Amino acid sequence: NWFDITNWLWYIKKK
Amino acid sequence: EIVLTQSPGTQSLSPGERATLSCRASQSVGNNKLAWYQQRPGQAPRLLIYGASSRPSGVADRFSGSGSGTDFTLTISRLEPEDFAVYYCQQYGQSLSTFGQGTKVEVKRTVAAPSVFIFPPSDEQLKSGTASVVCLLNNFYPREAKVQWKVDNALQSGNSQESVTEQDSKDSTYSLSSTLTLSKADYEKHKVYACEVTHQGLSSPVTKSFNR
Amino acid sequence: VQLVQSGAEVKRPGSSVTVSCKASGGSFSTYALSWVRQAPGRGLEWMGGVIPLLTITNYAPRFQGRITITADRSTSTAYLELNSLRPEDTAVYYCAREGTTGWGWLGKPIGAFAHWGQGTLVTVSSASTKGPSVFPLAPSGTAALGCLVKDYFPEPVTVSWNSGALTSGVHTFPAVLQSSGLYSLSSVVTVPSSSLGTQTYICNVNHKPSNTKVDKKVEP
Numbered sequence: 206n207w208f209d210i211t212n213w214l215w216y217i218k219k220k
Numbered sequence: 221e222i223v224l225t226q227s228p229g230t231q232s233l234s235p236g237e238r239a240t241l242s243c244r245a246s247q248s249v250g251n252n253k254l255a256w257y258q259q260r261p262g263q264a265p266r267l268l269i270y271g272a273s274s275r276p277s278g279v280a281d282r283f284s285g286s287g288s289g290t291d292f293t294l295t296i297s298r299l300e301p302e303d304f305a306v307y308y309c310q311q312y313g314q315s316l317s318t319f320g321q322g323t324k325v326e327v328k329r330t331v332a333a334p335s336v337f338i339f340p341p342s343d344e345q346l347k348s349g350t351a352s353v354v355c356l357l358n359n360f361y362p363r364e365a366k367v368q369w370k371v372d373n374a375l376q377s378g379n380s381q382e383s384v385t386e387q388d389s390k391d392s393t394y395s396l397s398s399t400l401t402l403s404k405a406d407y408e409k410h411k412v413y414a415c416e417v418t419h420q421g422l423s424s425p426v427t428k429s430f431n432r
Numbered sequence: 433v434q435l436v437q438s439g440a441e442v443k444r445p446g447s448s449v450t451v452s453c454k455a456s457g458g459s460f461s462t463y464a465l466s467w468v469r470q471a472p473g474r475g476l477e478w479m480g481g482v483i484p485l486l487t488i489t490n491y492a493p494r495f496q497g498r499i500t501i502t503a504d505r506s507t508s509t510a511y512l513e514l515n516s517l518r519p520e521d522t523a524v525y526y527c528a529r530e531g532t533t534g535w536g537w538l539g540k541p542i543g544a545f546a547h548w549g550q551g552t553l554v555t556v557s558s559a560s561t562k563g564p565s566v567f568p569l570a571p572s573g574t575a576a577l578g579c580l581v582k583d584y585f586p587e588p589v590t591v592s593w594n595s596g597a598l599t600s601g602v603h604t605f606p607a608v609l610q611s612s613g614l615y616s617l618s619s620v621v622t623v624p625s626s627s628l629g630t631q632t633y634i635c636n637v638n639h640k641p642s643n644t645k646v647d648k649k650v651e652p
Contacts, residue, residue: 221493253543253544255543255544255545257476257545259476264526264548264549264550264551265476265526265545265548266548267531267544267545267546270531270542270543270544270546271542271543271544274542276531276546308475308476310476310478310544310545312543312544315490316492316493317466317478317492318478319475319476319477319478320475321475322475322476335574335576335622337572337576339569339570339578341567342567342568342569342570342580344565344567344568345565345567345580345582348565352567352580352582352616354569354578354580354618356576356578356618356620358576358603358620358622359622381608381610381616382608383605383606383607383608383617384605384606385603385604385605385606395603395605395620396605397603397605397618397620399580399608399616399618401610
């Protein structure tokens with residue numbers, strides 16, 4: 206789901 | 221492709237009442253990624269609910285969302301004046317996002333027949349080679365109405381157009397304008413110009429007419 | 433977060449349109465930007481979107497082959513291009529960006545569209561700019577009167593009465609698009625019959641694109 210991409214992005218850029 | 225069905229497409233309710241709006245999906249919506257938006261005439265839509273039931277800060281807590289799978293509901297606990305608007309659901313649980321066709325929540329009021337008025341062409345316009353005849357159906361409820369043009373009692377087709385205003389914010393009525401357009405030469409071939417109106421508030425069709 | 437779009441545009445059938453959307457506030461690069469259109473009187477339709485940092489576009493099958501969405505991180509601007517335009521592409525096009533949770537605008541993305549541009553009306557037509565003729569709808573306890581604003585292009589036209597002093601009982605109708613490809617609209621007002629002697633009624637019509645500004649006195 207393309208709509209989930211930014212959430213993963215947000216998570217991996219915190220750490 | 222997920223088809224979202226919002227049915228009914230209109231709901232007539234009174235201020236202070238509860239409203240529950242249905243969104244049914246043709247297939248299960250992934251992770252309940254179902255949003256609801258409000259749109260008023262002339263404005264961009266505004267997000268009310270996301271993830272089926274989450275509400276942004278800023279959004280009135282009289283809006284709540286529920287459901288999962290294929291069966292979703294927007295609830296408005298008590299309708300304020302500004303809640304009369306169009307509501308759309310949207311799924312984004314697949315890369316192909318889709319919207320429902322919208323449900324218009326409008327103000328229910330007592331039935332009101334149109335006041336009907338017919339306007340012949342202006343002499344100004346007639347000088348220019350064209351004749352437009354206008355029929356006004358004013359301040360009626362509910363929205364459903366019909367007008368038929370007759371010229372020397374012959375039913376007209378293809379030479380008229382109409383539009384309807386938004387529900388009036390003060391009296392909750394609608395109005396409709398229809399224009400019949402002919403060349404001046406064709407206009408001058410006939411005598412009687414009539415608009416015939418049908419509406420729930422009229423026990424039989426009303427005709428206004430003039431004789432050229 | 434605010435999205436500001438480019439202005440209304442008239443395009444010829446078969447042409448391509450480009451609409452822009454400048455974001456300011458929050459992060460441009462890591463949030464999903466979509467385009468959603470609405471044909472006049474119809475519903476919202478999602479067209480596609482882009483995640484700029486990744487240059488990952490996602491297009492509705494219905495527009496795959498006609499659409500290009502791009503993002504320019506140097507200006508925080510997103511672009512919709514739509515080709516091979518046809519009358520049915522006449523619509524308001526909105527950009528919209530996903531919301532975020534919590535305080536500020538750098539929170540966790542929610543997918544759903546919290547932030548909307550003001551919209552851009554794209555009218556697909558072969559018509560040329562034309563100012564309307566303004567014709568009285570003369571009045572015959574209550575009388576109706578109005579003005580017919582006929583044959584203009586493109587939208588919009590605005591109408592007031594007595595320079596904005598008369599609003600009660602005024603109905604200004606949506607324009608209809610005639611077979612000529614020119615628009616026409618009507619504005620009416622109802623008033624007490626006895627005011628027709630004592631009071632002047634003037635419709636103030638404004639069509640900026642043709643600079644038609646007519647103040648038509650309507651009388652019995």
